[PDB]
Amino acid sequence: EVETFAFQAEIAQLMSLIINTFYSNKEIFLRELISNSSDALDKIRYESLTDPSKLDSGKELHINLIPNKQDRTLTIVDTGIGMTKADLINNLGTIAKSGTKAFMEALQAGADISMIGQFGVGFYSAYLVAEKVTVITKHNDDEQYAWESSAGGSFTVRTDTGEPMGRGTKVILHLKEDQTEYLEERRIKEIVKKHSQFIGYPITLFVEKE
Ligand SMILES: Cc1ccccc1[C@H]1CCCN1C(=O)c1cc(Cl)c(O)cc1O
Numbered sequence: 001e002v003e004t005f006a007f008q009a010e011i012a013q014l015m016s017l018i019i020n021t022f023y024s025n026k027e028i029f030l031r032e033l034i035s036n037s038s039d040a041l042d043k044i045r046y047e048s049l050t051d052p053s054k055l056d057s058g059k060e061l062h063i064n065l066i067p068n069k070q071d072r073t074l075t076i077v078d079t080g081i082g083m084t085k086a087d088l089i090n091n092l093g094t095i096a097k098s099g100t101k102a103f104m105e106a107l108q109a110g111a112d113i114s115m116i117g118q119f120g121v122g123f124y125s126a127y128l129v130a131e132k133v134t135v136i137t138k139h140n141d142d143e144q145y146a147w148e149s150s151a152g153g154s155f156t157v158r159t160d161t162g163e164p165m166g167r168g169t170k171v172i173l174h175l176k177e178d179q180t181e182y183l184e185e186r187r188i189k190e191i192v193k194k195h196s197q198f199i200g201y202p203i204t205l206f207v208e209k210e
Contacts, residue, residue, distance in 0.1 A: 002156050002158045003156060004154050005089060005155055005156070006094075007093045007149075008095060010096040011124070012153045014103070014104060018113070019151060021107075025112075026128040027182075027195075028113070030196070031117070031195035032123065032126075033076045033126065034063060034076065034195075035122060035199075037063045037078035037169070037201075038063070039080075040080025040082070041079070041080040042080075044061065044082075057138075057166045057167035061080070061201050062078070062079055063201055063203045063204070064077040065188055065203065067184075067185070067207075068183070068208070073173060074183060075170060075173070077169075077170045079166070079167055080169060081168075082137050082139035083139055083145075083169060085142055085143070088135070088137060092123065092135065099120040099121055102119055103116060126171065127151055129179040129182055130174055131176050132150040133149060133174070134174070135171050135172070136160050136165065136169070136170040137165075137170070138164070138165045143159055143160075192205065
């Protein structure tokens with residue numbers, strides 16, 4: 001079955017702001033998502049140091065970027081610690097961290113949207129370039145789940161039937177019509193070079209044939 005949840009009020013407000021505010025520097029979404037993957041990878045590594053068996057679900061720690069022009073999706077995949085169903089629901093929409101209103105209060109006055117990451121809500125910058133975001137995740141302690149939202153104040157969670165991931169999180173950006181530049185090899189390379197040069201895990205940019 002599919003479960004539908006309301007975003008907490010302030011998160012809905014943030015998402016609307018991200019979608020409606022004129023802001024040309026959209027590329028920062030990729031930095032924020034790679035940062036999130038890096039943090040998740042840090043966590044499973046940290047845990048594996050005391051209990052190595054937590055890598056039984058996959059020893060390699062990496063980030064893959066996978067453009068698909070036919071589906072018009074950009075997918076960020078990591079083999080980080082992943083999220084349980086509860087982690088998913090609690091951290092991707094139903095609970096507003098302090099940084100949510102702090103950020104929007106920051107946008108009032110001087111701050112610009114590129115600072116979003118500093119408030120711990122950088123995930124939502126995905127809606128700078130995506131009309132719908134799907135998050136597939138698998139944590140050692142739980143089943144594989146799919147989160148999805150086109151904003152508008154709700155998201156869904158369901159058990160995922162797709163290819164099993166072993167462990168980690170996959171963010172699938174269904175790109176807006178006018179944002180297909182982020183499917184281009186040279187454009188993604190440029191952004192990763194500029195914003196994510198010192199990530200401590202291998203980042204592989206997959207290519208497509210003509
Ligand atoms: C950083 C972060 C913020 C909010 C919730 C969860 C996370 C990370 C740490 C614990 C598990 N995790 C994730 O599974 C994860 C999530 C998102 Cl949103 C992503 O883009 C990539 C990921 O690997």
